[PDB]
Amino acid sequence: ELQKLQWAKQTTSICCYCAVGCGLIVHTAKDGQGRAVNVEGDPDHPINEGSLCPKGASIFQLGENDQRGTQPLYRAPFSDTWKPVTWDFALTEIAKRIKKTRDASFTEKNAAGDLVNRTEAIASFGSAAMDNEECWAYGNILRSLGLVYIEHQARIXHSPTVPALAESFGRGAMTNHWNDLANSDCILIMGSNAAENHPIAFKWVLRAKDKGATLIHVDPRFTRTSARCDVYAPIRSGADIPFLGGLIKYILDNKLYFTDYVREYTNASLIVGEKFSFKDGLFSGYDAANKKYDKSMWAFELDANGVPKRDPALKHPRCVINLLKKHYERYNLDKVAAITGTSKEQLQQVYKAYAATGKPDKAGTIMYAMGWTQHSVGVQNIRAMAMIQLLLGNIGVAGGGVNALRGESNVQGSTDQGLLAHIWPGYNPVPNSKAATLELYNAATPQSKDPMSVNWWQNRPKYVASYLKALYPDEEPAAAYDYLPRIDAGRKLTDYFWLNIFEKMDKGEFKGLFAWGMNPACGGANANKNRKAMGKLEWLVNVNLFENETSSFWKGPGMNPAEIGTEVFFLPCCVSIEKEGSVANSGRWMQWRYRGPKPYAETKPDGDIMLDMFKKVRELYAKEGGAYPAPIAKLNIADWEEHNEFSPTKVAKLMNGYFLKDTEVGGKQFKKGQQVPSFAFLTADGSTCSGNWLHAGSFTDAGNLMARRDKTQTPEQARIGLFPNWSFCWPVNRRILYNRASVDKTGKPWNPAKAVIEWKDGKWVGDVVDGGGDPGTKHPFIMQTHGFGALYGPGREEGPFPEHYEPLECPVSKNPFSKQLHNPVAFQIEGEKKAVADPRYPFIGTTYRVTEHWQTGLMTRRCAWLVEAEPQIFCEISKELAKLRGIGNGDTVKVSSLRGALEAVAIVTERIRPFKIEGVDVHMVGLPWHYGWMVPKNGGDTANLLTPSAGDPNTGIPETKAFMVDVRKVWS
Amino acid sequence: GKMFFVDLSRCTACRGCQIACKQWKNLPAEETRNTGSHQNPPDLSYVTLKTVRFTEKSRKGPGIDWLFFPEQCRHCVEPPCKGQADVDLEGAVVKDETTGAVLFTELTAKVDGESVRSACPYDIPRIDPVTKRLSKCDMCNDRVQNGLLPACVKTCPTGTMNFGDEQEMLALAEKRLAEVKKTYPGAVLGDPNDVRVVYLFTRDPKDFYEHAVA
Ligand SMILES: Nc1nc2c(c(=O)[nH]1)N[C@H]1C(S)=C(S)[C@@H](COP(=O)(O)OP(=O)(O)OC[C@H]3O[C@@H](n4cnc5c(=O)[nH]c(N)nc54)[C@H](O)[C@@H]3O)O[C@H]1N2
Ligand SMILES: Nc1nc2c(c(=O)[nH]1)N[C@H]1C(S)=C(S)[C@@H](COP(=O)(O)OP(=O)(O)OC[C@H]3O[C@@H](n4cnc5c(=O)[nH]c(N)nc54)[C@H](O)[C@@H]3O)O[C@H]1N2
Ligand code: SF4
Ligand code: SF4
Ligand code: SF4
Ligand code: SF4
Ligand SMILES: [Cl-]
Ligand SMILES: [Cl-]
Ligand SMILES: [S]
Ligand SMILES: [W+6]
């Protein structure tokens, strides 16, 4: 027996860092009664098999960390010191501040006279770091208080993936899962540094390569990923659409597309209306004065039955696939090479290797993340790759898909729970001010008259009614609908998102902010604006593991505490191994984890903090009365607690849902109190509650399916690694989305050796089928109104096809693709200066991660083994730029933009080379964003001092991956 | 006895192994600074038994050869370190003949530490300036005695790290060398008949580290 592990109890957990979702084994002293003594990998877990990267391997140091918060701290207005306070003081006073601010700001009706019942003077940020049950409860607390400004990591992360992939396929999530990568014939890693940022993924990537896959890395930098790939090609930051449109042209010109898949399963055959056109970089319907498109100009031509017209011959000039060929004909190799910097030879090599996967018995996959999302064209970057995958028949297949790699351990779950301003849990839209009734809300859902179109969102009334019953079980759904706040129908949606929240805050329009498990003083683009704007708050509640740049922004760089009136409450929460609950990984696997040690010192799990705070608000309303108290007073919080604490188990069962009365549904009889077995059995009439329809099926009368640790598989399942009995994925355990597209009209797989589903002896075997129906009876994309993979996607803010636009700060003021330089509807704030081919800021700036740190480094800058490996902010530059500026390797340099400046250590490397753009060498400056002024000594500050608060018009994500800077040697 | 086979053709320099070694032993961190490299700590030391060394070599066309070397004691079949320690005081360096581990004891404080380091053809031993004790990788010998993998082998995400009985591990090393040579024609095993940590280098081992091989 090992001395180290003697008299220690073993429990399982899931890594608190990235969305791979690796399993842990925790040992806790004194048979569970003491501190953690050891944290390492779970050998039985099917994803990591005991492996951990340096972040997972250091969780012991994170949890058992003498720098962790111990109890609440209070910073009075104009004070330079924290005062330790009790939980009771902190939460009593926070309840007073919430209520004072709500009672003064609450609006029953908007200026138009429409009911909105909202509090506009409080915002909340966070958090993908909380458990799923905590995320769900948190969003419901905030909406009961009337908030609409509710955001988190997702906004500044994978927000553009959701509309990009929902436009394309019907859903926003990663389509496949980590184990499935080993099934791929060609893995393109592009806009991702997976060997550093999803390290255990490389177990499965390299297994693909062992079985004959080609691995391709396309990145402005040569990284630790590039070192292990077969093909490495550079690409200039912000030049993805040229590269991807060139591959569309290549596939169409060479007839490398999967003809039958494209004809049957994509919208290739649909006829676009005569009002659609594109000229000189603008689609039809551009309103120059309002910087907006009239998207009605992009509509399909409809038949007399109101179904889009189709030409199965693919001959009509207005067929999607003919308009697609016409759009991408400009993307020839010479023009793509000239704008990307990528040689024609390397473009041909990558295009040939990847487009080879258009064969039915071959599968290509894309692994992407922030290199694609964090742009003013983030949605369109992703759309272009979704279109490629559809042309090649890679959607729905093993080893294929769009592997949009989620970031935080539960950013999939926090998005699923609606911690974004535009969505309730389960991707039901937040009502706008014109949806005056639940009937008017439901009438917005598109209907189909195509009998082969499943159009599954027609079930939305069941999900919204069951959600309103989860919150307000005593009320009819139509009555409860009036409790929840509404956004103004008249406004751009981006007015409600992260960047505009900070702009409003800088104008003094917010009294209070919750920084709940986020560090916006470091993680938000244009961090100088953020740090200044937080001093215009009356109060800030920061919930986090350590004191940090956000909690303590009032004593940050250049700040005078004596001039800053913001009252701050710092509330220390528990680490992941100190609580129970679920996290949803990038493949939508909802995994249950257990407590090892008790909470450190006087720290609390987020669920208890938010429930105790909310109960204090409810008690204060009982004492005083106030603004429209009903939504607060009536909220069903009985179901969230057991033994006077937050109950992960009870909240998870409520999220799944249960029957409030005896009900007959799907000709089955259910009893009051039974769990809902799946979302198929939810009702619109108030019989069922379900906090989140996607969770209906996760926690049934059979028990907690998220807690399953069964690696049992049928032969067909084990051939591709579905592990359907390991945890539970939404929706209803469909591990590979869109898997009806993986079979022909008879239900035979395109690629039998890697079948996902297969029609055998009158049933679908393998994965859970994504949409019920016999073979050939339904279009395969069941969440799409029309049923098809969309090559042409007319719901996007800057058009139905991707088109190259330069980054909003760019090295050239020419675009060879068209007259249009920038995204003509981009999110931007008037007055904010942009460096466009400015010789004062002549270098491309981009920001990215290293294996050893996490996020803003709030967590990992406290972990001595990770600081040891990567102690300081660095600046990566080529030898050629180093020579131009007289910078030696290891020298101190100053990187500057229009918005800020910071010092870093130069890393001079051949891993970065010039980008030859129209014959002219363009130099880049790379920075990590893991550093901040609080800790460690000489670590440096945030790269977000440099980044622009401007970006994608669809989702408001900032362009943190492509801006402009200068670099200069520091002589000190 | 046991053996590591370390397939450096699979290494992503994640440093999982570097952190896992410290977590298992509860080792302290060094004071480090960035001097123009991801590599850190820059060297083995009394508190650092494994560091991943990073070396960049120019290659024609885009990209480089980025060579990663997770350095540790090689657990020599016949360790010179022990021969030298034994000149000053026996019992400073002992062998586990079941596992093959070579093990430093606290009696290293009473031998000439610089001479013991000089005797190592891999330049592995490191001396504590305060106590004069020597440290290095101890093969996670107590884990191995208890039927577990070494911490750095268990943690590795890529199949770079492999551990098992010497006959199976040398057969695996020769099989993998033949396969990797299809892509990396200068691939070689490091001193495979002399050591219990057998590295597969993708090119001249001295490009990975000056003391990569004897
Ligand atoms: N080690 C580590 N892992 C993490 C995290 C972490 O902090 N540390 N954070 C987690 C989170 S929240 C997320 S969202 C994921 C993000 O994971 P990634 O997206 O992998 O993260 P980054 O390193 O920011 O960006 C990936 C790559 O984009 C490249 N790049 C820069 N500009 C461009 C461009 O315009 N186009 C293209 N094609 N590439 C470009 C960069 O050089 C970089 O190598 O990582 C998660 N995992
Ligand atoms: N320049 C630039 N900026 C970026 C990015 C980039 O690539 N470049 N990446 C963007 C992306 S993808 C993301 S996701 C964001 C991240 O931005 P933030 O979310 O602000 O980053 P952090 O706060 O560092 O990381 C998440 C927080 O979760 C906290 N936490 C951990 N466990 C718990 C818990 O149980 N409860 C609570 N309440 N808190 C907990 C951690 O302590 C940590 O502070 O940054 C974005 N910003
Ligand atoms: S950070 Fe990601 S890859 Fe690393 S151990 Fe955690 S879940 Fe696994
Ligand atoms: S854990 Fe494995 S892949 Fe990571 S650096 Fe160590 S040997 Fe290389
Ligand atoms: S075998 Fe054990 S002591 Fe040696 S490097 Fe690996 S973790 Fe460290
Ligand atoms: S590598 Fe050096 S320290 Fe390790 S056993 Fe061999 S001679 Fe001794
Ligand atoms: Cl203080
Ligand atoms: Cl030893
Ligand atoms: S994230
Ligand atoms: W993220």
PDB file of N, CA and C and ligand atoms in Angstrom, chain B residues 4 17-22 24-25 27 49-51 70-73 75 136-141 143-144 149-153 161 163 197, ligand 5:
ATOM      1  N   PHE B   4      11.167   2.020 -19.400  1.00  0.00           N
ATOM      2  CA  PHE B   4      10.371   3.036 -20.093  1.00  0.00           C
ATOM      3  C   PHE B   4      10.760   2.958 -21.561  1.00  0.00           C
ATOM      4  N   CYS B  17       3.762  15.536 -17.825  1.00  0.00           N
ATOM      5  CA  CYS B  17       4.736  14.667 -17.126  1.00  0.00           C
ATOM      6  C   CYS B  17       5.522  15.506 -16.111  1.00  0.00           C
ATOM      7  N   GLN B  18       5.957  16.690 -16.540  1.00  0.00           N
ATOM      8  CA  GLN B  18       6.731  17.587 -15.666  1.00  0.00           C
ATOM      9  C   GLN B  18       5.915  17.956 -14.433  1.00  0.00           C
ATOM     10  N   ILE B  19       4.634  18.265 -14.603  1.00  0.00           N
ATOM     11  CA  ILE B  19       3.763  18.678 -13.466  1.00  0.00           C
ATOM     12  C   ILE B  19       3.426  17.445 -12.638  1.00  0.00           C
ATOM     13  N   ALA B  20       3.089  16.319 -13.271  1.00  0.00           N
ATOM     14  CA  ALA B  20       2.690  15.090 -12.570  1.00  0.00           C
ATOM     15  C   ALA B  20       3.819  14.615 -11.648  1.00  0.00           C
ATOM     16  N   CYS B  21       5.067  14.677 -12.089  1.00  0.00           N
ATOM     17  CA  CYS B  21       6.213  14.297 -11.230  1.00  0.00           C
ATOM     18  C   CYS B  21       6.185  15.116  -9.938  1.00  0.00           C
ATOM     19  N   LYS B  22       5.924  16.410 -10.066  1.00  0.00           N
ATOM     20  CA  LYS B  22       5.886  17.330  -8.890  1.00  0.00           C
ATOM     21  C   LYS B  22       4.659  17.060  -8.031  1.00  0.00           C
ATOM     22  N   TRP B  24       2.991  14.253  -7.660  1.00  0.00           N
ATOM     23  CA  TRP B  24       3.065  12.964  -6.950  1.00  0.00           C
ATOM     24  C   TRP B  24       3.978  13.102  -5.715  1.00  0.00           C
ATOM     25  N   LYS B  25       5.102  13.789  -5.856  1.00  0.00           N
ATOM     26  CA  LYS B  25       6.112  13.962  -4.780  1.00  0.00           C
ATOM     27  C   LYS B  25       5.860  15.202  -3.925  1.00  0.00           C
ATOM     28  N   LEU B  27       6.637  18.250  -4.735  1.00  0.00           N
ATOM     29  CA  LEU B  27       7.904  18.977  -4.875  1.00  0.00           C
ATOM     30  C   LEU B  27       7.625  20.461  -4.964  1.00  0.00           C
ATOM     31  N   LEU B  49      13.078  17.066 -11.088  1.00  0.00           N
ATOM     32  CA  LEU B  49      13.600  15.723 -11.512  1.00  0.00           C
ATOM     33  C   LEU B  49      13.364  15.488 -13.016  1.00  0.00           C
ATOM     34  N   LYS B  50      12.478  16.239 -13.620  1.00  0.00           N
ATOM     35  CA  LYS B  50      12.121  16.145 -15.035  1.00  0.00           C
ATOM     36  C   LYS B  50      11.764  17.539 -15.511  1.00  0.00           C
ATOM     37  N   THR B  51      12.392  17.958 -16.601  1.00  0.00           N
ATOM     38  CA  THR B  51      12.004  19.185 -17.320  1.00  0.00           C
ATOM     39  C   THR B  51      11.906  18.807 -18.784  1.00  0.00           C
ATOM     40  N   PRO B  70      11.649  15.253 -22.670  1.00  0.00           N
ATOM     41  CA  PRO B  70      11.330  15.152 -21.241  1.00  0.00           C
ATOM     42  C   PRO B  70      12.451  14.342 -20.573  1.00  0.00           C
ATOM     43  N   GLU B  71      13.403  15.057 -19.981  1.00  0.00           N
ATOM     44  CA  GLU B  71      14.633  14.463 -19.432  1.00  0.00           C
ATOM     45  C   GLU B  71      14.337  13.828 -18.070  1.00  0.00           C
ATOM     46  N   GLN B  72      14.925  12.655 -17.842  1.00  0.00           N
ATOM     47  CA  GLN B  72      14.962  12.012 -16.515  1.00  0.00           C
ATOM     48  C   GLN B  72      16.161  11.070 -16.428  1.00  0.00           C
ATOM     49  N   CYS B  73      16.510  10.722 -15.210  1.00  0.00           N
ATOM     50  CA  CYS B  73      17.466   9.612 -14.968  1.00  0.00           C
ATOM     51  C   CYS B  73      17.132   8.429 -15.892  1.00  0.00           C
ATOM     52  N   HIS B  75      18.112   5.272 -15.302  1.00  0.00           N
ATOM     53  CA  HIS B  75      18.067   4.025 -14.491  1.00  0.00           C
ATOM     54  C   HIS B  75      18.973   2.996 -15.165  1.00  0.00           C
ATOM     55  N   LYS B 136      17.231  13.065  -8.092  1.00  0.00           N
ATOM     56  CA  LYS B 136      16.923  12.752  -9.503  1.00  0.00           C
ATOM     57  C   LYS B 136      15.616  11.979  -9.485  1.00  0.00           C
ATOM     58  N   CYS B 137      15.163  11.600 -10.669  1.00  0.00           N
ATOM     59  CA  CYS B 137      14.046  10.689 -10.885  1.00  0.00           C
ATOM     60  C   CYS B 137      14.333   9.389 -10.122  1.00  0.00           C
ATOM     61  N   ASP B 138      13.366   8.921  -9.356  1.00  0.00           N
ATOM     62  CA  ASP B 138      13.471   7.644  -8.604  1.00  0.00           C
ATOM     63  C   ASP B 138      12.574   6.563  -9.204  1.00  0.00           C
ATOM     64  N   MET B 139      12.209   6.738 -10.477  1.00  0.00           N
ATOM     65  CA  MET B 139      11.373   5.771 -11.229  1.00  0.00           C
ATOM     66  C   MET B 139       9.992   5.615 -10.600  1.00  0.00           C
ATOM     67  N   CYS B 140       9.564   6.530  -9.716  1.00  0.00           N
ATOM     68  CA  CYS B 140       8.313   6.330  -8.958  1.00  0.00           C
ATOM     69  C   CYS B 140       8.334   4.909  -8.407  1.00  0.00           C
ATOM     70  N   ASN B 141       9.437   4.537  -7.777  1.00  0.00           N
ATOM     71  CA  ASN B 141       9.672   3.121  -7.438  1.00  0.00           C
ATOM     72  C   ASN B 141       8.570   2.604  -6.507  1.00  0.00           C
ATOM     73  N   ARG B 143       5.334   3.559  -6.399  1.00  0.00           N
ATOM     74  CA  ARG B 143       4.191   3.241  -7.280  1.00  0.00           C
ATOM     75  C   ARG B 143       4.438   1.910  -7.982  1.00  0.00           C
ATOM     76  N   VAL B 144       5.628   1.726  -8.523  1.00  0.00           N
ATOM     77  CA  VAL B 144       5.933   0.540  -9.371  1.00  0.00           C
ATOM     78  C   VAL B 144       5.860  -0.702  -8.464  1.00  0.00           C
ATOM     79  N   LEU B 149       1.680   2.484 -12.646  1.00  0.00           N
ATOM     80  CA  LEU B 149       2.588   3.189 -13.553  1.00  0.00           C
ATOM     81  C   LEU B 149       3.247   4.357 -12.824  1.00  0.00           C
ATOM     82  N   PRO B 150       4.480   4.714 -13.207  1.00  0.00           N
ATOM     83  CA  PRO B 150       5.061   5.991 -12.824  1.00  0.00           C
ATOM     84  C   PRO B 150       4.123   7.157 -13.157  1.00  0.00           C
ATOM     85  N   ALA B 151       4.164   8.206 -12.327  1.00  0.00           N
ATOM     86  CA  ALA B 151       3.207   9.327 -12.475  1.00  0.00           C
ATOM     87  C   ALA B 151       3.291   9.917 -13.883  1.00  0.00           C
ATOM     88  N   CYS B 152       4.494  10.072 -14.422  1.00  0.00           N
ATOM     89  CA  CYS B 152       4.692  10.730 -15.746  1.00  0.00           C
ATOM     90  C   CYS B 152       4.191   9.806 -16.864  1.00  0.00           C
ATOM     91  N   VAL B 153       4.257   8.507 -16.666  1.00  0.00           N
ATOM     92  CA  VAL B 153       3.764   7.567 -17.698  1.00  0.00           C
ATOM     93  C   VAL B 153       2.237   7.592 -17.678  1.00  0.00           C
ATOM     94  N   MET B 161       4.893   8.174 -23.561  1.00  0.00           N
ATOM     95  CA  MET B 161       5.439   7.433 -22.417  1.00  0.00           C
ATOM     96  C   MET B 161       4.852   6.037 -22.382  1.00  0.00           C
ATOM     97  N   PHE B 163       5.629   2.079 -20.295  1.00  0.00           N
ATOM     98  CA  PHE B 163       6.356   1.433 -19.188  1.00  0.00           C
ATOM     99  C   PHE B 163       5.903  -0.006 -19.055  1.00  0.00           C
ATOM    100  N   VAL B 197      15.548   3.744 -19.440  1.00  0.00           N
ATOM    101  CA  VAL B 197      14.709   4.785 -20.101  1.00  0.00           C
ATOM    102  C   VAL B 197      15.189   4.884 -21.536  1.00  0.00           C
TER     103      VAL B 197
HETATM  104  S1  SF4 C   5       9.316   8.155 -13.168  1.00  0.00           S
HETATM  105 FE1  SF4 C   5       8.380   9.224 -11.369  1.00  0.00          FE
HETATM  106  S2  SF4 C   5      10.162  10.359 -10.475  1.00  0.00           S
HETATM  107 FE2  SF4 C   5      10.757   9.772 -12.589  1.00  0.00          FE
HETATM  108  S3  SF4 C   5      10.221  11.525 -13.941  1.00  0.00           S
HETATM  109 FE3  SF4 C   5       8.451  10.138 -13.926  1.00  0.00          FE
HETATM  110  S4  SF4 C   5       7.088  10.975 -12.275  1.00  0.00           S
HETATM  111 FE4  SF4 C   5       9.167  11.838 -11.923  1.00  0.00          FE
END
